[PDB]
Amino acid sequence: ARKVLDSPVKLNSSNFDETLKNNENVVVDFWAEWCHPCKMIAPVIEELAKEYAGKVVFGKLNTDENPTIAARYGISAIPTLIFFKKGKPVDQLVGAMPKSELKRWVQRNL
C-alpha cells in the first residue's frame, strides 16, 4: 500500500525532539546548501526514504538554519547521518557514502 511518510522531512526546533520522541527509528541528515557532498547524496537519501517508508523516518536538519541543534551532536563535518533508536543516537556516518554502504548502515541499526 502507500505510506504516510515516504520521503525526507524537514526538521527544526518545532519538531526535532518531538520527531525523535514519537518515532522509533529516525535517520537525521545534517546538511547545508553550500555543501557539495550533501547535494551529491540527496538523491540516495530520497530513494532510501521511499524504500524504508513506514519503518525509518528520514529527517533533514539544515546546519546553517539550526546551528544549536547541530552543535548539540557536535557536527564537525557534513553530510553527517545519525541513526536515532527510541530517540537516542546509536550510530553515525560521516561524509558522502555509496547507497550500498548507506543501506547496510540502516540495516545494521534498524
Side-chain angles (χ1 to χ4, degrees):
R2 189 167 167 175
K3 314 304 177 191
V4 178
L5 292 173
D6 58 12
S7 66
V9 56
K10 171 182 173 187
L11 302 184
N12 59 21
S13 292
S14 68
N15 68 346
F16 184 88
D17 292 311
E18 295 77 1
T19 297
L20 296 184
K21 173 179 169 263
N22 295 327
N23 300 274
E24 286 284 316
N25 300 278
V26 180
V27 174
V28 182
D29 176 14
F30 296 85
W31 75 285
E33 181 52 37
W34 53 261
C35 167
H36 170 59
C38 306
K39 307 297 293 196
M40 288 292 284
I41 66 167
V44 169
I45 295 172
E46 290 181 355
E47 292 287 1
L48 288 175
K50 302 202 190 77
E51 178 172 356
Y52 285 93
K55 298 190 179 65
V56 180
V57 175
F58 282 78
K60 298 191 84 171
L61 189 288
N62 182 289
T63 59
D64 288 346
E65 299 169 357
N66 308 270
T68 301
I69 294 172
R72 193 207 295 188
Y73 299 99
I75 306 299
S76 58
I78 48 171
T80 296
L81 305 191
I82 297 179
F83 198 106
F84 292 91
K85 174 73 80 173
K86 292 184 165 59
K88 295 174 172 58
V90 296
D91 204 345
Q92 309 195 16
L93 260 180
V94 184
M97 296 299 192
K99 182 175 183 174
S100 298
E101 178 178 348
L102 217 312
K103 179 171 174 176
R104 286 193 301 268
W105 180 76
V106 174
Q107 289 174 315
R108 181 173 298 102
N109 291 282
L110 181 58

PDB file of all heavy atoms in Angstrom, residues 44 48 97-108:
ATOM      1  N   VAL A  44      20.139   9.686  -3.138  1.00  0.00           N
ATOM      2  CA  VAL A  44      20.191   8.373  -2.499  1.00  0.00           C
ATOM      3  C   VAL A  44      19.325   8.363  -1.238  1.00  0.00           C
ATOM      4  O   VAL A  44      18.628   7.384  -0.967  1.00  0.00           O
ATOM      5  CB  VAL A  44      21.651   7.971  -2.153  1.00  0.00           C
ATOM      6  CG1 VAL A  44      21.708   6.724  -1.242  1.00  0.00           C
ATOM      7  CG2 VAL A  44      22.452   7.752  -3.439  1.00  0.00           C
ATOM      8  N   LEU A  48      16.126   5.860  -0.384  1.00  0.00           N
ATOM      9  CA  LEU A  48      16.068   5.053   0.827  1.00  0.00           C
ATOM     10  C   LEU A  48      14.863   5.437   1.681  1.00  0.00           C
ATOM     11  O   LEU A  48      14.288   4.594   2.368  1.00  0.00           O
ATOM     12  CB  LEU A  48      17.358   5.195   1.633  1.00  0.00           C
ATOM     13  CG  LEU A  48      18.588   4.503   1.039  1.00  0.00           C
ATOM     14  CD1 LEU A  48      19.820   4.822   1.853  1.00  0.00           C
ATOM     15  CD2 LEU A  48      18.396   2.993   0.957  1.00  0.00           C
ATOM     16  N   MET A  97      28.664   8.839   1.049  1.00  0.00           N
ATOM     17  CA  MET A  97      28.825   7.389   1.007  1.00  0.00           C
ATOM     18  C   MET A  97      27.963   6.761  -0.087  1.00  0.00           C
ATOM     19  O   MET A  97      26.910   7.296  -0.434  1.00  0.00           O
ATOM     20  CB  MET A  97      28.464   6.771   2.357  1.00  0.00           C
ATOM     21  CG  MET A  97      29.374   7.194   3.499  1.00  0.00           C
ATOM     22  SD  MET A  97      31.097   6.723   3.243  1.00  0.00           S
ATOM     23  CE  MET A  97      31.773   7.038   4.872  1.00  0.00           C
ATOM     24  N   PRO A  98      28.407   5.620  -0.638  1.00  0.00           N
ATOM     25  CA  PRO A  98      27.588   4.928  -1.641  1.00  0.00           C
ATOM     26  C   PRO A  98      26.268   4.419  -1.056  1.00  0.00           C
ATOM     27  O   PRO A  98      26.181   4.193   0.154  1.00  0.00           O
ATOM     28  CB  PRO A  98      28.476   3.756  -2.083  1.00  0.00           C
ATOM     29  CG  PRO A  98      29.852   4.094  -1.620  1.00  0.00           C
ATOM     30  CD  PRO A  98      29.685   4.926  -0.399  1.00  0.00           C
ATOM     31  N   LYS A  99      25.260   4.241  -1.905  1.00  0.00           N
ATOM     32  CA  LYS A  99      23.953   3.765  -1.456  1.00  0.00           C
ATOM     33  C   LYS A  99      24.053   2.422  -0.746  1.00  0.00           C
ATOM     34  O   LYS A  99      23.366   2.192   0.247  1.00  0.00           O
ATOM     35  CB  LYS A  99      22.990   3.646  -2.635  1.00  0.00           C
ATOM     36  CG  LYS A  99      21.584   3.206  -2.240  1.00  0.00           C
ATOM     37  CD  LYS A  99      20.642   3.235  -3.432  1.00  0.00           C
ATOM     38  CE  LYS A  99      19.225   2.863  -3.035  1.00  0.00           C
ATOM     39  NZ  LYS A  99      18.267   3.026  -4.168  1.00  0.00           N
ATOM     40  N   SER A 100      24.907   1.542  -1.259  1.00  0.00           N
ATOM     41  CA  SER A 100      25.071   0.209  -0.688  1.00  0.00           C
ATOM     42  C   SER A 100      25.547   0.280   0.760  1.00  0.00           C
ATOM     43  O   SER A 100      25.071  -0.465   1.614  1.00  0.00           O
ATOM     44  CB  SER A 100      26.061  -0.613  -1.520  1.00  0.00           C
ATOM     45  OG  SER A 100      25.589  -0.797  -2.842  1.00  0.00           O
ATOM     46  N   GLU A 101      26.489   1.177   1.028  1.00  0.00           N
ATOM     47  CA  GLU A 101      27.034   1.333   2.371  1.00  0.00           C
ATOM     48  C   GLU A 101      26.003   1.987   3.283  1.00  0.00           C
ATOM     49  O   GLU A 101      25.881   1.637   4.461  1.00  0.00           O
ATOM     50  CB  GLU A 101      28.320   2.161   2.340  1.00  0.00           C
ATOM     51  CG  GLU A 101      28.931   2.423   3.712  1.00  0.00           C
ATOM     52  CD  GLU A 101      30.230   3.212   3.640  1.00  0.00           C
ATOM     53  OE1 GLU A 101      30.780   3.367   2.528  1.00  0.00           O
ATOM     54  OE2 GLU A 101      30.702   3.676   4.699  1.00  0.00           O
ATOM     55  N   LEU A 102      25.272   2.946   2.723  1.00  0.00           N
ATOM     56  CA  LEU A 102      24.214   3.640   3.443  1.00  0.00           C
ATOM     57  C   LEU A 102      23.137   2.660   3.901  1.00  0.00           C
ATOM     58  O   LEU A 102      22.712   2.679   5.055  1.00  0.00           O
ATOM     59  CB  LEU A 102      23.592   4.719   2.556  1.00  0.00           C
ATOM     60  CG  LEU A 102      23.177   6.026   3.233  1.00  0.00           C
ATOM     61  CD1 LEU A 102      22.371   5.767   4.493  1.00  0.00           C
ATOM     62  CD2 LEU A 102      24.401   6.876   3.531  1.00  0.00           C
ATOM     63  N   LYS A 103      22.701   1.802   2.984  1.00  0.00           N
ATOM     64  CA  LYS A 103      21.651   0.835   3.275  1.00  0.00           C
ATOM     65  C   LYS A 103      22.092  -0.178   4.332  1.00  0.00           C
ATOM     66  O   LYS A 103      21.323  -0.507   5.232  1.00  0.00           O
ATOM     67  CB  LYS A 103      21.224   0.111   1.996  1.00  0.00           C
ATOM     68  CG  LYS A 103      20.144  -0.938   2.219  1.00  0.00           C
ATOM     69  CD  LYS A 103      19.586  -1.468   0.907  1.00  0.00           C
ATOM     70  CE  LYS A 103      18.623  -2.626   1.142  1.00  0.00           C
ATOM     71  NZ  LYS A 103      17.995  -3.108  -0.122  1.00  0.00           N
ATOM     72  N   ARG A 104      23.322  -0.674   4.228  1.00  0.00           N
ATOM     73  CA  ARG A 104      23.840  -1.612   5.226  1.00  0.00           C
ATOM     74  C   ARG A 104      23.879  -0.949   6.599  1.00  0.00           C
ATOM     75  O   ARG A 104      23.624  -1.589   7.620  1.00  0.00           O
ATOM     76  CB  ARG A 104      25.235  -2.116   4.845  1.00  0.00           C
ATOM     77  CG  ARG A 104      25.245  -3.132   3.704  1.00  0.00           C
ATOM     78  CD  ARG A 104      26.593  -3.821   3.592  1.00  0.00           C
ATOM     79  NE  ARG A 104      27.673  -2.870   3.350  1.00  0.00           N
ATOM     80  CZ  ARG A 104      28.115  -2.515   2.145  1.00  0.00           C
ATOM     81  NH1 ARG A 104      27.579  -3.033   1.045  1.00  0.00           N
ATOM     82  NH2 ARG A 104      29.104  -1.636   2.038  1.00  0.00           N
ATOM     83  N   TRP A 105      24.197   0.340   6.611  1.00  0.00           N
ATOM     84  CA  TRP A 105      24.225   1.120   7.839  1.00  0.00           C
ATOM     85  C   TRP A 105      22.840   1.155   8.484  1.00  0.00           C
ATOM     86  O   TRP A 105      22.704   0.932   9.687  1.00  0.00           O
ATOM     87  CB  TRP A 105      24.729   2.532   7.538  1.00  0.00           C
ATOM     88  CG  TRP A 105      24.814   3.446   8.714  1.00  0.00           C
ATOM     89  CD1 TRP A 105      25.767   3.444   9.687  1.00  0.00           C
ATOM     90  CD2 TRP A 105      23.923   4.524   9.025  1.00  0.00           C
ATOM     91  NE1 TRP A 105      25.520   4.448  10.591  1.00  0.00           N
ATOM     92  CE2 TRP A 105      24.395   5.127  10.207  1.00  0.00           C
ATOM     93  CE3 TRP A 105      22.772   5.036   8.418  1.00  0.00           C
ATOM     94  CZ2 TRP A 105      23.753   6.212  10.797  1.00  0.00           C
ATOM     95  CZ3 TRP A 105      22.135   6.115   9.004  1.00  0.00           C
ATOM     96  CH2 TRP A 105      22.628   6.692  10.182  1.00  0.00           C
ATOM     97  N   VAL A 106      21.814   1.420   7.680  1.00  0.00           N
ATOM     98  CA  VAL A 106      20.436   1.372   8.158  1.00  0.00           C
ATOM     99  C   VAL A 106      20.083  -0.023   8.679  1.00  0.00           C
ATOM    100  O   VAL A 106      19.545  -0.168   9.774  1.00  0.00           O
ATOM    101  CB  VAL A 106      19.437   1.764   7.044  1.00  0.00           C
ATOM    102  CG1 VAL A 106      17.995   1.565   7.507  1.00  0.00           C
ATOM    103  CG2 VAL A 106      19.654   3.210   6.619  1.00  0.00           C
ATOM    104  N   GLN A 107      20.388  -1.047   7.889  1.00  0.00           N
ATOM    105  CA  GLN A 107      20.032  -2.420   8.246  1.00  0.00           C
ATOM    106  C   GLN A 107      20.701  -2.870   9.535  1.00  0.00           C
ATOM    107  O   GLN A 107      20.161  -3.694  10.267  1.00  0.00           O
ATOM    108  CB  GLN A 107      20.407  -3.375   7.115  1.00  0.00           C
ATOM    109  CG  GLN A 107      19.536  -3.228   5.891  1.00  0.00           C
ATOM    110  CD  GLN A 107      20.013  -4.070   4.731  1.00  0.00           C
ATOM    111  OE1 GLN A 107      21.208  -4.118   4.430  1.00  0.00           O
ATOM    112  NE2 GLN A 107      19.078  -4.744   4.066  1.00  0.00           N
ATOM    113  N   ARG A 108      21.882  -2.326   9.798  1.00  0.00           N
ATOM    114  CA  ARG A 108      22.655  -2.686  10.977  1.00  0.00           C
ATOM    115  C   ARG A 108      22.021  -2.148  12.257  1.00  0.00           C
ATOM    116  O   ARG A 108      22.203  -2.722  13.330  1.00  0.00           O
ATOM    117  CB  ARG A 108      24.088  -2.164  10.832  1.00  0.00           C
ATOM    118  CG  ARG A 108      25.001  -2.500  11.999  1.00  0.00           C
ATOM    119  CD  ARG A 108      26.448  -2.101  11.721  1.00  0.00           C
ATOM    120  NE  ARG A 108      27.002  -2.822  10.574  1.00  0.00           N
ATOM    121  CZ  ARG A 108      27.143  -2.319   9.348  1.00  0.00           C
ATOM    122  NH1 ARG A 108      26.785  -1.068   9.075  1.00  0.00           N
ATOM    123  NH2 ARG A 108      27.657  -3.076   8.387  1.00  0.00           N
TER     124      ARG A 108
END
